[PDB]
Enzyme design. Structure first.
Site, PDB file in Angstrom:
ATOM      1  N   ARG A  14      28.347  31.116  70.088  1.00 22.84           N
ATOM      2  CA  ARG A  14      29.625  31.992  69.137  1.00 22.84           C
ATOM      3  C   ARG A  14      30.092  32.398  70.989  1.00 22.84           C
ATOM      4  NH1 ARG A  14      30.030  33.213  64.265  1.00 22.84           N
ATOM      5  NH2 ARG A  14      29.880  35.592  64.946  1.00 22.84           N
ATOM      6  N   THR A  20      36.892  36.741  66.617  1.00 19.16           N
ATOM      7  CA  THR A  20      37.686  35.743  65.137  1.00 19.16           C
ATOM      8  C   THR A  20      38.734  35.524  65.738  1.00 19.16           C
ATOM      9  OG1 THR A  20      35.881  36.303  64.013  1.00 19.16           O
ATOM     10  CG2 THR A  20      37.319  36.065  62.863  1.00 19.16           C
ATOM     11  N   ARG A  70      38.586  29.517  70.649  1.00 19.88           N
ATOM     12  CA  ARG A  70      39.719  29.875  70.098  1.00 19.88           C
ATOM     13  C   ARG A  70      40.633  30.749  71.049  1.00 19.88           C
ATOM     14  NH1 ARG A  70      35.605  33.017  66.047  1.00 19.88           N
ATOM     15  NH2 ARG A  70      35.476  30.859  64.721  1.00 19.88           N
ATOM     16  N   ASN A 119      41.230  29.198  62.974  1.00 18.95           N
ATOM     17  CA  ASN A 119      41.310  30.018  64.525  1.00 18.95           C
ATOM     18  C   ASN A 119      39.785  28.505  64.838  1.00 18.95           C
ATOM     19  OD1 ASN A 119      39.002  30.636  62.664  1.00 18.95           O
ATOM     20  ND2 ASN A 119      38.971  32.225  63.328  1.00 18.95           N
ATOM     21  N   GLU A 177      22.680  27.924  57.322  1.00 20.60           N
ATOM     22  CA  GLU A 177      23.613  27.188  57.040  1.00 20.60           C
ATOM     23  C   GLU A 177      23.399  26.006  57.821  1.00 20.60           C
ATOM     24  OE1 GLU A 177      26.587  28.844  59.852  1.00 20.60           O
ATOM     25  OE2 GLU A 177      26.882  30.845  58.518  1.00 20.60           O
TER      26      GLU A 177
END
Lengths: 132, 131, 135, 127, 135, 135
Positions: free
Chosen positions: D77, D83, D95, D105, D119
Site C-alpha cells: 500500500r 488513490t 501512483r 491509477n 482477493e
C-alpha cells in the site's frame, strides 16, 4: 562545511545496496569526504550507541557483519542525509522515495544511519574517523 | 488541454539534470509541448518574478542559460508542482520529488512550475508568446 | 570545442524518450549548447536528408521527419561527434545497434530508430548550420 | 508469511509499466509468490468489486500477483500510494510517479489481511 | 505478429530481477502477451532442453530449471525473436554477453545466466507450444 | 574466491560516480571485500603504474592519480577479474569501450576514464598486495 556521519549497516551490505545508498547521497549534491568498509568492535559499538543505554541488540547487529562508514559533506548535510534516509520505521514512518521507504520493511533492518544533529555528527565523526 | 510552464533554472543545467527533470515529467504521463534552451533578459526576469516584488531571484535567473518548457496533460499544473516538490528542498520538498532528491537549498532549487491556472496562462504568454 | 547536431525524431517524442535521451548525453559528460522542440518543413527535411536523395528510402524519410515535432540540439564536448554516435548506436536497432545504446535499448526497426547524431566533422558543420544558423 | 494481492490494471500494461511495478515490489524486499497475465471476466470483476470500475478492469489484460514478505500488506500500500495520484499519492510511489487521475491509477494492492485473503482466494484459488 | 518465448530462470527470481528483465523487454518496445510464474516438471525440463541432449551439461540444465519457480512469458512485436536475444546477451555472461545486456549487466557464470529467449522462429514456435499450449 | 583490485580515479569522485560504479559491480553479482577513500602518494602511483614507465603518457598517469582522492576496493566473486574488466570497458571510452560499460556510458577521453580494474590474476595479486597489504 557541514559534515555528517553515515553508516551503511550490515543489512545494507548483505542486500548489495552500498552503491544505491551512496548514489542517493551524491545526487542530492553532497560529497563523500571519507569512506571505509570495516568491522565493528563491541568497544566502538557501545560508544556509537551511548545515547541509548537505558540498546543491547543494536550492539549485537552492528557487530554481526561489516559496515560502511562515510563522512558526508555539503550545505545542510545533516538534515539532508536524514531526509534521504527516512524515518526509523521503513513502512510506518519512512516516506516513499527515501532509502528506508524504498528498500526496507522493518526497523531492526533499516539499512542506514545518519547523524541526528550537529552535536551527534561531531561525536560520531570523532568516533569513526578520529583525525578527520 | 491543461498546460503549465516549466523552467529548469541555471543550477539545473549546470548539474546536468535537464534529462532527469524532463524524464520525470514524461514518466508522470505528461507531454512536452514546447521546449527551448535560452538566456534570460532582465525585463523577462522581473515579469516572471512579478509576484515576488527578489534581487537574488532576478540575479540568478540571468546568471546562465535556462530551459523553458510548456508541459501539457490532464491535471498538468498540479502534477508538475507535485513532481517538483516544495520550495525548500530539505525542509519542505518530499523525498521522491526533483527538489527532494536533488537539491539542498532554496536559492538553488533547480526547477519551477506554474502555481495555478492564472499563473500558467501568464507565464506561458511571457515565455512562449504565440503558443 | 567540438560540436555535433542531435535530433530526437518524432517517434522519440511520441514514446516519451526526450528526457532519457538527453540524460544519456549529459551522463557521458557532454553539454547541451542549444535545444529546441520544433516542426520540420519540407524544405528543411529535404536539405537535412539531401545526402540520401538517390536512395529508395528517401521519400519516407522526408514525410516521417515532417509527421510530427522533433527536438534539435547542439551537443558540445571533447570527442562529441564520435561520442554521440557511440551513444545512439548503429542504424538498425536490432541487427547493428549495441546493447546499452539508445537504439539498442529502445528501438526495433530502422524506420523508427528514435534519434540522429551527425556522422562526421563535415556533417556536423553542415547540420548545425542548417538547424541552428546563428550558432 | 504475510501475503497480499497485487493487480496491475489495464492502464499499467498499456503504459509498459509491468516491469517497473514489479521491480519496486522486489527492491522493497518482497517476493513474488505467484504471477499471471490474464483477461478478467464480468463475473470475476463483480466479485473483486463488491465493497467499492467494472467497465475498465475488463477492457484489457491485467497482471495479478501474490506478494509475500514481512509487512507485505502495508508495504505494498505504501509503494502504491494513495488513490488519487496527484492529490493523495506521495512522490516516490507508483501512483505519485506515474499517474494523473484516479480512474487510471495503474495498480491495486489488498487493503487488509481480510481483503488479502478474499482477493487471493478469488484470483489464485488453491494458492 | 512475431512472437518468442522468454524464461526467467530460478536464479533470476532468487535475485529479484523479475521486474528488471520485464522492464528491459518493455522499454525495447515489445509487448508481454502472456506471463506466468510456475514450477517446472522433469518432463517439461527435458522437452525445453531437448536440443542439448548430447551435451555434458544436459543433466545440470534440467536439475537447475526444476530447483525452483520460473517465470515464463510470450513476448510479441516486430523482430521480437532477435530483439530478445539481443537484450538477453550471449550465453557466457562475462566471456560472450555484451555490456548493457541482461546477462552482461547481472550475471557471472553460464550455469546461472538468469534468462532465456527462443533462438529462432522454429525454436520460438516449439517453445511457445510447449510452455503455453493454446496460445 | 577470485579477487580483483578496483580503483575509482579522481575524475570518478569529482563527477559523483562513486555510487554508480559500486552499484554496477554489486548488480553484476560481485561483492565489495574492502573499500577505502584515500589520497595516493607519489611512491604508490609509480608502483601502481610501473608497467607503463617507458610510455609517452607515463608522467600524465602519475600526476593525475595523485591530483585528488581515489576510492580503492577489493572486489570478490566468481570470475571477478574478467567481470570487472567487462563492466569497466576498454581503455578509450569512445573508440574502445562498449556502450553499457562504465567508460562507454560516462567518459570521453582516455586520460579521464574514471575507473581501473586489474587486468589479470597476476596483476590482481600484485595490485591488491600494493593497495591493501593486509588483505
Amino acid at each position: 562545511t557541514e559534515r555528517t556521519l553515515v553508516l551503511i549497516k550490515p543489512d545494507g551490505i548483505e542486500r548489495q545496496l552500498i552503491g544505491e545508498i551512496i548514489s542517493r547521497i551524491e545526487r542530492k549534491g553532497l560529497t563523500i569526504a571519507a569512506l571505509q568498509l570495516r568491522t565493528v568492535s563491541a568497544e566502538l559499538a557501545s560508544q556509537h550507541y551511548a545515547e541509548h543505554e537505558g540498546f543491547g541488540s543494536l550492539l549485537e547487529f552492528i557487530t554481526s557483519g561489516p559496515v560502511v562508514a562515510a563522512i558526508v559533506e555539503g550545505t545542510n548535510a545533516i538534515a539532508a542525509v536524514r531526509q534521504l534516509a527516512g524515518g526509523t520505521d521503513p513502512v510506518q514512518a519512512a516516506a516513499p522515495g527515501t532509502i528506508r521507504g524504498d528498500f526496507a520493511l522493518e526497523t531492526q533492518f533499516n539499512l542506514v544511519h545518519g547523524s541526528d544533529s550537529a552535536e551527534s555528527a561531531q561525536r560520531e565523526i570523532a568516533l569513526w574517523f578520529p583525525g578527520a
